[PDB]
């Protein structure tokens, strides 16, 4: 319950924050991947897509935050919950996340990789 309410707080508050604070804020947030609750993982994923869409566009630290966000998102591609798998597939299959052109989609996903996945 604390995890859920804290993540809801983060979801309602991030646009007010700045990348300098967001760095240190997110540094422990990503720890809750593989947490024993699909709810918290889903909420932090919502955080992650919010950041990624708001940071896929420049300051070096913001670039580092956005890189960490995309990295953990790639780590989030593997889900024990099939619903999380479906929602992450819906997210990544989107045009902004993946170019509609098959050639361009292939070129984009080349960068997408994790040694864990």
UniProtKB/Swiss-Prot annotation:
It comes from the Eukaryota. It is found in: Nucleus; Nucleus, Nucleolus; Cytoplasm, Cytosol. The modification Phosphothreonine is found at residue 102. Coiled coil: none annotated. Belongs to the PI3/PI4-kinase family. DNA-PK is a heterotrimer of PRKDC and the Ku dimer (composed of XRCC6/Ku70 and XRCC5/Ku86). Formation of this complex may be promoted by interaction with ILF3. Component of the core long-range non-homologous end joining (NHEJ) complex (also named DNA-PK complex) composed of PRKDC, LIG4, XRCC4, XRCC6/Ku70, XRCC5/Ku86 and NHEJ1/XLF. Additional component of the NHEJ complex includes PAXX. Following autophosphorylation, PRKDC dissociates from DNA. Interacts with DNA-PKcs-interacting protein (KIP) with the region upstream the kinase domain. This is DNA-dependent protein kinase catalytic subunit. It comes from Homo sapiens (Human). The chain holds residues 2430 to 2550 of 4128 of the full protein.
């Amino acid at each position: 319950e604390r995890q859920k309410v804290c993540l809801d707080i983060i979801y309602k508050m991030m646009p007010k924050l700045k990348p300098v604070e967001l760095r240190e804020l997110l540094n422990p947030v990503v720890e809750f991947v593989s947490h024993p609750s699909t709810t918290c993982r889903e909420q932090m994923y919502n955080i992650l897509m919010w950041i990624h869409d708001n940071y896929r566009d420049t300051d070096n630290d913001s670039q580092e935050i956005f890189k960490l966000a995309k990295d953990v998102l790639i780590q989030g591609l593997i889900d024990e919950n099939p619903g999380l798998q479906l929602i992450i597939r819906n997210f990544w299959s989107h045009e902004t996340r993946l170019p509609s052109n098959t050639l361009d989609r292939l070129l984009a996903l080349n960068s997408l990789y994790s040694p864990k996945i």
